[PDB]
Amino acid sequence: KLELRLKSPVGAEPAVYPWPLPVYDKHHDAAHEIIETIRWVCEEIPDLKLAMEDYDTKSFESMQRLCDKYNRAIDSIHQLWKGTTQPMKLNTRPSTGLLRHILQQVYNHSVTDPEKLNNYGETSFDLVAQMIDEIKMTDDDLFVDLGSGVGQVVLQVAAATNCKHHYGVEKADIPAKYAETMDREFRKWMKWYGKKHAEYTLERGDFLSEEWRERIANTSVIFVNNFAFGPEVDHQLKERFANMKEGGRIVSSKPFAPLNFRINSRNLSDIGTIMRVVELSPLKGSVSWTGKPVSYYLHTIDRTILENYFSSLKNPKLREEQEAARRRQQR
Template structure:
């Protein structure tokens, strides 16, 4: 390949008026199993900007986005140049109006965010196979949770700006970044101890900030931390959270037991979403299980979603636990009152 071709660039101007994003030619090809397609990424990025800017959509879709050759540098350069001129024109027309502030200081749509997260994952996680190099069913087993599952969780639990979210075993950070973009949580935190996911999470963090700024989209505060979530230094942060997410499907009994000890200190109303339930769905308090975590939580099953995790295509159930200490208080009140003992079965 000629030396001159290696240094060719394709530039996309920001719809928010910040620094342009540069792609280097030749673009990555989508031929390999784990390779992403750089040309497809450019076209999809333009399409998502068009979804945000109706004036641009009308200008681009008529003939520009329907006629290009992803194998030709000249064709892709013309596509980018036409997009750049169009978005520059829109921004120029909007100068001095309130349109930029109202349009570009919002959270991204779910479709746009999925594109952004896929985009940054493809660049940050250069060797996805390394994420699976753990002993099967060990506490460190790595399984990525799907975008759709987190959307389902967001839809089913009421989230406010007072909520604090924590992902225990956050991998490369996708769940935390998604929660930060789509919810008004005060802060979203991820804790991961494995070296490889943490290394990739650092790059995910950098690219997420870069692309969210480029699109002009806001997000809640977030933090991706390296560490063992079972260590003492993280306990206060976890017990102070109101939403806990944990993909504990293959953690094993020892880790689950230690997590239960941490969860026993969560505040009333705190919610835990996990891939394995921390107590039976039909748990009933008796004098033999008064020390069980089930005495202070209600548990229900979220509707199974096919493809909700990366390690199986089968539908995987997730469970919602809500901390409620009045459950145990009601049990003792009924014990004191012989007339209420008959209803103990319902506790």
């Protein structure tokens, strides 16, 4: 029983891999996970990168010499820390590049069958990363991913931001079950790298349920990939969003209200009356399964829109303007 071992840079339990090195799917195997782990820990620790400076991934001797060189380097770094040199971070967030590796790693050891996840740590990572950069979140924010799958988007945001809490709600059995493993693996691997994450919870359930009505209402930042949602589900969501607090934000792949929404007495009930909607900057060179560049939509709860409309009704000048417009429009 041959093995390959990688020591943790912060003294956690070693990562152990059986030889021959397992294959996860067509584009991921343990060999490259080992190589990627080594070189990301080198990015973590400059002295390590400085010492390390990796040939045949199908030779045991070649791979073992790679792991040995890494582990011996780690030992020297730990001795270096016992001296006058200050130890590593231990409370920092992972860089975007490292976080991508970690999530991929977590996915590799959680989802043993990527084939029964038949939908439509994927390469939405960069999309979500762009949103994390643009949508500012603080420690008073509550984050929710509506329909969170195996939970990778929640994990990514939780690793990146300092929201008070992050939630993922998932309805189906299989992804919710995998999410339990994703959760356990994530906490383990983040510790292995010595990286911090904000609080998060991956739950089972339906976000249309009566329980989630109040929960949505109290959420300050919602991510929902709703592009392929039918009109009934989207309508139900609009009803939920209507109870959100001022300044509450919804980021989605399909708008919940029109961008050029003009309020009148025919659309007084519509969600557009209480939110600003903008199309966010797309990420250069993206493209989705439809072959089009990905666009995102930011909704911000703002009830001054409605307030100002009601004020305008009290103004006789504005009133004539509105009423003359309506009659002209009906043509």
